[PDB]
């Protein structure tokens, strides 16, 4: 029904930390996927687009809290935390921490430490109206070999073979002077495959007669031996 | 000349054969208030020797007879009795509601509602398994969208 | 303080609809879900069924199936529930319930509303 | 569907006891249970949600646990705000199916 994709960047060390039924540091007190998770975890390494030589002051990882956050909770509070007995109503003390510090992802750090994105997609599993259109079918196209054809309608059997027809840009069906709807160009490609018979022909039994002997031989009228002893 | 009548899902078909009928006691039963034959005529019922008289009776609604022809969609004529396009024969329909009719309703009569697919010409099914409406496995029990095909 | 309020009473007729709010406060109206639950006279909760703040995207319960609608704004932030042909059994004190978590997941009931006599009779 | 079956369906005990209500299921459901109470009068209140850990704004009286296909919730003492009915749901992930049981009230013994 509704995919909710959610992109950020974490740490390289805590790729698999978010995850379904995990305890982690950024998992807890932070996004954290609940034991129900029906999305993926797709992810991918950003040593080059998200790395700077510099203090790298982008980031940050959001440590402290004051209770565990609930699934796909996004706090956009920038509040004082307040470990114990040590209220901060100005700036933070000596016991108050800030729930911000800057993530330092240097290029000379290998993996454990490099920029990863990672997004995840929420898969809304509710019963409710799906796509507006629906699962749009396809199927690899075959050449050389009977198929029984339906491209935009054009419904019919024959071997799809390359054709040299180049149509006017602007036609689609393709039909002859008897009204054979021959050549078809393909609906999502630019291809035109010229349309031909599904080889068929005419069976003859050649029979040297019952009295003479029993042996016969049967002829394919209209067949290269090619659709399907001497 | 009977009273007792099952549903519309079932028949009681009796197959009378191996007697010669007379199709002139018909009229003279009760007073019907349909009469469809199809391929055949009603005045010539009494020369011609069929050979095999299939014979079933049900009880159906007033707006359901139209249903009951060869060719004919519905809800009772694609889920509960499926004529064939070249069906030859007569059918006899009389309204009953001075015996199956009682003041605090009559709950006897069942009627299979959908199925998944269409019944075949000359087909019985009384099979009572439950129809699953929904995505979730019934374990053969009516609960909310569990619900039963009588 | 998050206060779900509801409406009174209501009464209706056999083969009907009878149209009930839930308008919600506190809490902004996109991230969490809410559920409308019916509680009969002795008996207990019988149907579920989620409505999306953000979209269309509901799910009625199965025993309905059809016959109940429940739609969204986001302008007033209010919910409407509209169940069609009232029968002699439907009459209830519906309920309106959210959830503790977010618009993906879903775990349980946390904050209710008030309730709404439903009634089928003359 | 999971048809929820309270077996006692009515606990008469003394405020200041200890009480243990069982509701159990047929598929697994460790992980997924939730518990409730519904005082005369009013909406019903979140008890136990998850069935592992405890709810917002629940005293500490009010402990549950339980795992596999047999659950129960224990008080620690009675209250007289304590005594209401409390009922049971599993939370179904793909379909959307939250059932619920029969519930059992809570007496008073005199």
């Known amino acids: 029904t509704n995919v909710y994709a959610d992109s950020f960047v974490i740490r390289g060390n805590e790729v698999s930390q978010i995850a379904p039924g995990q305890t982690g540091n950024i998992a807890d007190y932070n996004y954290k996927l609940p034991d129900d998770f029906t999305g993926c975890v797709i992810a991918w390494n950003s040593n080059k687009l998200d790395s700077k030589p510099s203090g790298n002051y982008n980031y940050l990882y959001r440590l402290f809290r004051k209770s565990k956050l609930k699934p796909f909770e996004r706090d956009i509070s920038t509040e004082i935390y307040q470990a114990g007995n040590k209220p901060c109503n100005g700036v933070a003390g000596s016991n108050c921490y800030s729930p911000l510090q800057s993530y330092g992802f240097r290029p000379t750090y290998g993996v454990g430490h490099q920029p990863y994105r990672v997004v995840v997609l929420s898969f809304e599993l509710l019963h409710a109206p799906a796509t507006v259109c629906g699962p749009k079918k396809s199927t690899n196209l075959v050449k050389n070999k009977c198929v029984n054809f339906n491209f935009n309608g054009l419904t019919g059997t024959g071997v799809l073979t390359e054709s040299n027809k180049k149509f006017l840009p602007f036609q689609q069906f393709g039909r002859d002077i008897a009204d054979t709807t021959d050549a078809v160009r393909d609906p999502q490609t630019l291809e035109i495959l010229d349309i031909t018979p599904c080889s068929f022909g005419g069976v003859s039994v050649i029979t040297p007669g019952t009295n003479t002997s029993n042996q016969v031989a049967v002829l394919y009228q209209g067949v290269n031996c090619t659709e399907v002893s001497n | 000349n009977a009273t007792t009548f099952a549903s519309v899902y079932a028949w009681n078909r009796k197959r009378i054969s191996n007697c010669v009928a007379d199709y002139s006691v018909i009229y003279n039963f009760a007073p019907f208030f349909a009469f469809k034959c199809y391929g055949v005529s009603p005045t010539k019922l009494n020369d011609l020797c069929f050979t095999n008289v299939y014979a079933d009776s049900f009880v159906i609604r007033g707006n359901e007879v139209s249903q009951i022809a060869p060719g004919q969609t519905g809800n009772i004529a694609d889920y509960n009795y499926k004529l064939p396009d070249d069906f030859t024969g007569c059918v006899i329909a009389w309204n009953s509601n001075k015996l199956d009719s009682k003041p605090s309703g009559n709950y006897n009569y069942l009627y299979r509602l959908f199925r998944k697919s269409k019944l075949k010409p000359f087909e019985r099914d009384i099979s009572t398994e439950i129809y699953q409406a929904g995505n979730k496995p019934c374990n053969g029990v009516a609960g909310s969208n569990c619900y039963s095909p009588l | 303080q998050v206060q779900l309020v509801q409406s009174g009473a209501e009464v209706k007729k056999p083969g009907a609809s009878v149209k009930v709010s839930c308008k919600t406060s506190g809490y902004t109206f996109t991230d969490h879900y809410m559920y409308w639950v019916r509680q009969a006279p002795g008996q207990g909760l019988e149907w579920m069924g989620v409505?999306?703040?953000?979209?269309?995207?509901?799910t009625y319960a199965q025993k309905f199936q059809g016959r109940v609608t429940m739609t969204s704004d986001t302008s007033t932030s209010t919910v409407y529930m509209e169940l069609s042909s009232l029968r002699s059994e439907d009459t209830a004190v519906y309920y309106c319930?959210?959830?503790?978590?977010?618009?993906?997941?879903?775990?349980?009931?946390?904050?209710w509303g008030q309730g709404t006599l439903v009634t089928v009779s003359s | 569907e999971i048809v929820l079956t309270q077996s006692p369906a009515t606990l008469s005990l003394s405020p200041g006891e200890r009480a243990t209500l069982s509701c159990r299921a047929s598929?697994?459901?460790?992980?997924?249970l939730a518990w409730y109470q519904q005082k005369p009068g009013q909406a019903p209140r979140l008890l136990i949600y998850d069935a592992t850990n405890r709810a917002t704004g629940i005293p500490a009286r009010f402990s549950g646990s339980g795992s596999g296909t047999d659950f129960t919730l224990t008080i620690s003492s009675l209250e007289p705000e304590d005594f209401a009915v409390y009922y049971c749901?599993?939370?179904?992930?793909?379909?959307?199916?939250?059932?619920f049981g029969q519930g059992t009230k809570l007496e008073i013994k005199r």
């Open positions: 598929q697994s459901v460790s992980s997924y």
């Open positions: 749901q599993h939370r179904s992930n793909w379909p959307r199916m939250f059932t």
């Open positions: 319930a959210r959830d503790l978590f977010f618009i993906p997941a879903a775990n349980s009931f946390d904050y």
């Open positions: 409505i999306n703040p953000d979209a269309g995207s509901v």
